[PDB]
Ligand binder design. Structure first.
Ligand SMILES: [Zn+2]
Lengths: 156, 191
């Protein structure tokens, strides 16, 4: 197919992840040997095609992830799949760049912690003791503007 | 502006006293004044099973409240906009009340375990004291036997717990200082 073979090459190109010879790539899968896959690759951003020698890349750094997190303010949500093909082991980078340096959405630690784009200042704020969270949650937040009334009584 | 410190303190308490997905949604809500839930859903890119409770906590914390903002759809139907409206005065006042209830409780804990006096029996495990037992001292004895087991007693209490409570108030004040920094800073204009 025109869509299956070119997609097969792009994943094959994606799997390589390095600038390979235009001859090394075409024989890599033995499927994208027609000009349609290359033309689709050149017409699209799936495979980076340039007038120079055979170089296959995307159209990627912990610093850039900060830029990426900054660029995802007031915007949609992106998975870490482009962050996992995208500076491999960004989970290491997220844990190392903790405290908002590489924020994460850790739904659970069994799916490579599939996270999203998150922007924060403190990010981690693990200084707050766990019991303090309990005794924080131990307190139930009250009703309407008597809450300003109670605290003026307390002087807050 | 005073609102950013209101926002910054909110992100502080909710990153410290709540999870990260809480601050992800709060920023998401803070990303747009009138934010559709659908855009919020795609930003999180997670199931509704992981979006609602975080919004519920923000509603419970009164940091952000649900506003029935008039949305007139173009499909000849009636669709509301699920756009969160941040209730800042009720956000900070509630946080203060939590702060006030958390500090006095742990303050009360400090006074709970301060002073040792009284015995026990360690055989039948019944508590004792100076006085009831000195009633029980015998002229031929130096130590207080037990009424029950006829078997001498031991002392019991430990002020260690008061020290344990002293550290907790120390720990809570260290945790609460940036919170009460922002609150008083917010308290200038009541915003
Ligand atoms: Zn006894």
């Amino acid at each position: 197919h025109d869509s299956s073979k070119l997609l097969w090459a792009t994943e094959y190109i994606q799997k390589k992840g390095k600038p390979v010879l235009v001859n090394e790539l075409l024989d890599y899968l033995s499927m994208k040997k027609d000009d349609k896959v290359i033309e689709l690759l050149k017409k699209l951003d799936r495979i980076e095609f340039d007038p120079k020698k055979g170089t296959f890349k995307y159209l990627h750094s912990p610093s850039e992830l900060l830029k990426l997190l900054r660029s995802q303010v007031t915007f949609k949500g992106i998975s870490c799949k482009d962050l996992k093909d995208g500076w491999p082991q960004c989970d290491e980078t997220i844990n190392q760049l903790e405290e908002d340096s590489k924020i994460l959405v850790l739904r659970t630690k069994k799916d490579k912690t599939p996270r999203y784009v998150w922007y924060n200042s403190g990010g981690n704020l693990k200084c707050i003791d766990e019991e303090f969270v309990k005794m924080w949650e131990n307190v139930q937040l009250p009703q309407f503007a008597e809450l300003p009334r109670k605290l003026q009584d307390l002087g807050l | 502006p005073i609102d950013d410190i209101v926002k910054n303190l909110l992100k502080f308490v909710v990153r410290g006293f709540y999870g990260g997905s809480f601050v992800l949604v709060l920023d998401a809500i803070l990303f747009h004044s009138v934010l559709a839930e659908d855009d919020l859903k795609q930003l999180l890119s997670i199931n509704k099973t992981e979006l609602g409770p975080l919004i519920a906590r923000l509603r419970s914390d009164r940091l952000i409240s649900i506003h029935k903002q008039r949305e007139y759809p173009p499909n000849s139907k009636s669709v509301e906009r699920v756009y969160y409206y941040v209730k800042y005065p009720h956000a900070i006042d509630a946080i203060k009340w939590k702060v006030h209830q958390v500090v006095q409780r742990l303050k009360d804990d400090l006074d709970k375990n301060s002073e040792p006096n009284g015995y026990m029996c360690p055989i039948c495990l019944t508590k004792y004291t100076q006085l009831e037992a000195v009633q029980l001292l015998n002229f031929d004895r130096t130590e207080f036997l037990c009424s029950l087991c006829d078997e001498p007693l031991v002392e019991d209490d430990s002020g260690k717990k008061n020290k344990e409570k002293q550290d907790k108030l120390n720990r809570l004040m260290d945790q609460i200082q940036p919170i009460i920094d922002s609150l008083k800073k917010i308290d200038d204009s009541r915003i």
